[PDB]
Design a protein around this ligand. Sequence first.
Ligand code: MET
Length: 512
Amino acid sequence: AKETFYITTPIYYPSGNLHIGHAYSTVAGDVIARYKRMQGYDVRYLTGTDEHGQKIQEKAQKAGKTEIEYLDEMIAGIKQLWAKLEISNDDFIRTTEERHKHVVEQVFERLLKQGDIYLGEYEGWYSVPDETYYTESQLVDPQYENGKIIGGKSPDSGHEVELVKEESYFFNISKYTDRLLEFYDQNPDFIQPPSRKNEMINNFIKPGLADLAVSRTSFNWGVHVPSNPKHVVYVWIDALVNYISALGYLSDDESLFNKYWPADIHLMAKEIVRFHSIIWPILLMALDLPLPKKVFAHGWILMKDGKVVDPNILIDRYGLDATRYYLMRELPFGSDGVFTPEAFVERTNFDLANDLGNLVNRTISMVNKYFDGELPAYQGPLHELDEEMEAMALETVKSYTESMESLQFSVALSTVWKFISRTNKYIDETTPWVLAKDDSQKDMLGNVMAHLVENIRYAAVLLRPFLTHAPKEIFEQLNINNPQFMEFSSLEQYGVLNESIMVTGQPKPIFP
Ligand code: MET
């Protein structure tokens, strides 16, 4: 049948206001999903939210709300954003749903019966704003009193770390140390980019995998341990199983789970890769489940010094295509990006409105002026330049694909704009207005317009994963009504338009 592809975003904390960093994660996963659906995969694209823990409970407590009411309100605004960004997620998984909660209970009960989980006491440091256990030496701005650390802050968030000293269940992750290390030997590509692996092994595995405190006795808000209801399951164990619980794991019908698991990519930001690539594999080893194929960790979007840009405000001012394009263009593979408002409008006005927007405008006007809208049919590479430009178009599809497969979206986008820049330069080289003056050069004039439009069609098809408005408008104004000419397989042979087409007599702007 159709080959499967399962890609996931991380499930986010409904903590206040989403930022372009979480919008990047969701837009990039959508670009993957849309891209894979265009290639003829059976794609499942999952996102969701992380609703349990002390952090969320304190936020709802501070708000003067219940957890569900506070959550329901935050989740409503999160989903408002995804609908506006136009995310093609096949499912949305909330951890407060019983279809999730029952899987967390059964996974915990099972690990207890295996002897993988045992009871004890965690003493040490914890950042509730990070939901992360820390050791003495990991603390930032530590407090020494008679040679002993009695306080500090989190290296991630910079928030004050608090002392934990309570009864807790421990997942024996220490005994999977060599098996996880052997997994990295067999599968060195597991973490993409590979540059993020060695720091993560050096910081988190080398000093010794301490057993992970996987339950909590102090707070109330979370999945309760069924054998011992006073214990509430740790948020990160609770959260991690959303990728399998949403597929119907440990239900009557695991047909969706057998189909889509293991996941092809787990997409995330670089500060939560330790959970998905140490704990998440060790956990699946304990459940005897096949591990993920990739864990793509992307960089941050900095603010000219360090890390309050609202996606909503960008979409309202400059449109969706501008905001979506900017995100994928300005964050490279293995790098962080800077948001500057100057950089944003340059990318919106010069790349979209001018380079692509005015290419379609220049082309359609010349077809209206020189042929009254009747765009001539494609014959062949009749012009001197056509042969290497047609090869350029097929190399653009080739190079783009290689960039899309290795998760280099800014390089694929720069490759496509190289081609759009060429197509604009083709107007300057051919000088169609000089061909229009001669009656014997009508055949060559029509060749240039047909190549102009076929170059645009190539670009619009390649931008369908990235841009959800522009290609669709481009086909309407050009009057390309065949939905097969909007697919990737129509780019295999240049010059698909063999019958003439009546283009629009009222060309309107593609971009706002
Ligand atoms: C299993 S992914 C959990 C991610 C977590 N909610 C975060 O915001 O970092």
